[PDB]
Design a protein around this ligand. Structure first.
Ligand SMILES: O=C1CN(C(=O)C2CCCC2)CCN1
Ligand SMILES: O=C1CN(C(=O)C2CCCC2)CCN1
Ligand SMILES: [Zn+2]
Ligand SMILES: [Zn+2]
Ligand SMILES: [Zn+2]
Ligand SMILES: [Zn+2]
Lengths: 360, 360
């Protein structure tokens, strides 16, 4: 069985389980079941399944070098699939709630979930809660007797909290820390003093890397009973790196990829986001460039956004991106090498993760 | 040590733990820590702590009849407190997100969290996510080596999902099931055919009773290692009953308690809620009363709301409430008696729960 086709099959099985259970134990009626079925498919399907598929890929890696009965190979692949879906549904939770929080319009060239006419914000916030609750229902059901149940639940729990903390860093990244105050409406920064590499890095680490890279890799290890083939500090460091890199790409695209091909109109400029472009631009601007940036950043007005785009264009950020790229390629090879020591196989899995990131 | 004073002390300890950990492991800065501290206090403190205190009360009950070292008594009380806070913070999650979902204005005579000037919806949806994540951080920290860890986490997980399912029933309770459709904007019901006792009962069971009555009682049992003193089907049935009754009270108050003393302007009429008043009114109206109700229900216009209030006034719903009240008092005494058999002590704890509900 090919990996993707196994993964998608397990979706159908997990969906049927969750919906059947709503009927038999939660007194749901057909039409509400259909609503939740459509919600699940619209929010969970349609991307590349990179995160879910990484758990499958890590487990397939260990399968090739570990002696197992066939039924045991099958159980581990099924566990890897269910695990991947947990991460997919965790992401779906985050995307639904984030889209509502940020007033987004589109995602994947389709409307955000809350903007569907029969959904609305009132239902969508709760739908996003259900998506995450489903991750736990899956885990307690499929993994109830598994030796890795507690470690998986505990990891999932930490990643989720880290992500929510990351979200908070992200949404507050245009404020001056010393002005945060629930009693007082928050002005956008005027000095941009908090637009630094280290601050940028902290947003991306919490907001993205833990759920996008750390979780899928470590879940792979957990379902394979293989956490002893690795140095968990290395896995963290390599995930950090690749994750930060992933975000730098998506920050460049928010600004420069055509809307049709992005799946979204980008608004990082107008939301006054601590993007890599803004940080890197401020790291090399002269005084007159900094005043012009400040006059035009974080304003809805299209003329002012066109000015920020102009400033980045003439800043030769491509040179900074190539230099950043070169250093990440450098460091990730070092970490892959250090991971070769204990696990050739895991290190290959991280290699493949790195490749699928380094392209798109 | 008095119970409340123990419970509130444990708040301070859990808050310090969660905030200290954000600093030492999540790279948080002081001002974001202060924001989350204010968020925690504004969303978690200020009510009666009925749910949290029930876990403490159930555990104190078993303490009086079970032989333990003093340090063991202390650990169980501390576990009961932490457990109660988990339920409190779960509720705080639900209240923050619900207030946003329903466009609420006030709660407890203070503004809803999302309406604080320095918060906004963008942050508040994520703050509510953090509140629930905190429940898990608490459990894995304080209960890491406890024999009841898995059963507590698994119960908490089910209650939370049930609640979210309940929320969905509640928000969709003015729609015709056969018209639910994410593609199509949802019209309010015209026939009110789904405003029945059984449908009402289903909303309340999922939305309220599991988290308000079931969870605190069973958590009490879990931290006391006492789940074998009870017939879990009885605990469920008694919780169902008392919980349904609790909601009937709050449905009567939404309509009739002065706003100042309620802590809220009631909007159940204008939100076209499946309240007990509406269901019970439709259960005894004549044809002309039903047409007038239908002309005026679920409309913001104050004149039309005053008309629905008038209809309930002249319907003699007090007689239906006294009859419902009498039957609940009846059935709960039966269940308390059936619970006396295995646990005199638990049954007393359910008695006290019943009393604090039956008044206010
Ligand atoms: O730098 C860090 C690392 N931490 C972890 O790895 C937790 C979160 C994700 C899995 C366990 C704590 C947060 N900050
Ligand atoms: O009628 C029911 C009963 N159920 C439970 O008791 C689950 C949820 C709360 C604790 C376990 C399943 C849902 N419906
Ligand atoms: Zn966002
Ligand atoms: Zn982006
Ligand atoms: Zn509500
Ligand atoms: Zn109410």
């Amino acid at each position: 069985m090919a990996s993707m086709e196994r993964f998608l099959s397990v979706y159908d099985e997990v969906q049927a389980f969750l919906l059947d259970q709503l009927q038999s134990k939660y007194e749901i009626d057909p039409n509400r079941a259909r609503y939740l079925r459509i919600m699940m498919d619209t929010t969970c399907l349609g991307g590349k399944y990179f995160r879910g598929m990484t758990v499958v890929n890590v487990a397939e890696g260990f399968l090739a070098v570990t002696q197992h009965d066939e039924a045991t190979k099958e159980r581990i692949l099924h566990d890897a699939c269910v695990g991947g879906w947990m991460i997919e549904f965790l992401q779906a939770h985050y995307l639904v709630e984030d889209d509502i929080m940020d007033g987004s319009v589109m995602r994947r060239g389709k409307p955000c979930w809350y903007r569907f006419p029969g959904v609305t914000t009132q239902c969508a916030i709760n739908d996003g809660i259900i998506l995450k609750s489903w991750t736990q229902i899956m885990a307690w059901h499929y993994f109830a007797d598994r030796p890795f149940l507690k470690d998986l639940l505990c990891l999932f729990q930490k990643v989720d909290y880290a992500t929510a903390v990351g979200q908070m860093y992200d949404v507050t990244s245009m404020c001056d820390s010393n002005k945060l105050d629930p009693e007082v409406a928050q002005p956008m920064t005027t000095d941009f003093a908090e637009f630094t590499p280290a601050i940028y890095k902290r947003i991306v680490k919490y907001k993205t890397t833990f759920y996008t890279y750390l979780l899928p890799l470590v879940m792979g290890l957990l379902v394979s009973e293989a956490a002893a083939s690795v140095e968990m500090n290395l896995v963290e460091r390599v995930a950090h790196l690749i994750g930060e890199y992933f975000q730098v790409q998506d920050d460049v695209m928010d600004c420069f990829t055509p809307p049709e091909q992005l799946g979204k109109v980008g608004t990082d400029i107008e939301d006054a986001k601590c993007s890599w472009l803004a940080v890197t631009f401020l790291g090399k601007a002269n005084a007159a460039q900094v005043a012009e940036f400040k006059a035009n950043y974080g304003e809805k007005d299209p003329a002012k956004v066109a000015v920020v785009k102009r400033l980045y264009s003439k800043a030769n950020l491509q040179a900074d991106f190539a230099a950043y790229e070169a250093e990440v390629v450098r460091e990730v090879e070092s970490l892959i090498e250090q991971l070769k020591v204990k696990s050739p196989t895991f290190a290959e899995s991280v290699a493949v993760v790195w490749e699928k990131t380094h392209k798109r």
